[PDB]
């Protein structure tokens, strides 16, 4: 916190909130392609669900 956080905040530190499946041990996923959580297809940067 004392080295790594910042007063208005630090925000460089992404985690991942979604994935079609669990990953395998020591897998690394760099893909940022939009997660189609709903029944609709979803090209473009966002959508509902």
């Amino acid at each position: 916190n004392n080295l790594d956080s910042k007063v208005g905040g630090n925000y460089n530190y992404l985690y991942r909130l979604f994935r079609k499946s669990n990953l395998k041990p020591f897998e690394r996923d760099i893909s940022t392609e939009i997660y189609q959580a709903g029944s609709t297809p979803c090209n473009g940067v966002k959508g509902f669900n």
């Binding site: 909130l17 979604f18 959580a37 709903g38 029944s39 509902f48 669900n49």
Partner: protein, 48 residues
């Protein structure tokens, strides 16, 4: 789908038990402009 809502100073609150909570009929509707969670995720609610 009720007509009138309470204020934020006197916020309403309903106890829920003795039911099955189908989120599919709720969450899979674009009528919501916000839906954001803090210990759970929409893709797993019905398994909880």
């Amino acid at each position: 789908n009720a007509t009138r809502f309470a204020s934020v100073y006197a916020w309403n609150r309903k106890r829920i038990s003795n039911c099955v909570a189908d989120y599919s009929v709720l969450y899979n509707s674009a009528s919501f402009s916000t839906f954001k969670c803090y210990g759970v995720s929409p893709t797993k609610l019905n398994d909880l």
